Amino acid sequence: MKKYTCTVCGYIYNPEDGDPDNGVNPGTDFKDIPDDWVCPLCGLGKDQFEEVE
């Protein structure tokens, strides 16, 4: 699985760590995250994210 980052703010989603405070457990592929989950830092949605390489 790949990290994704928010291209509006730098927030890196790391699949290893999930985002547990918002319901996304460790091991959750970004593409498996609920499409109504927001960047925990800027409060925008998945669509401002891109795959990291």
Q: What share of the chain is helix, strand, coil (3-state, %, to 5)?
A: 15, 25, 60
Q: What is the closest distance, in whole angstroms, from the C-beta atom of residue 24 to Fe ion in the complex?
A: 15
Q: What is the closest distance, in whole angstroms, from the C-beta atom of residue 7 to Fe ion in the complex?
A: 8
What DSSP character marks residue 5? E
Say whether residue 9 binds Fe ion (CB under 5 A): yes
φ and ψ of 14, to 5 deg: -115, 120
Q: Which residues bind Fe ion (CB under 5 A)?
A: 6, 8-9, 11, 39, 41-42
Binding site listing for Fe cation: 6, 9, 39, 42
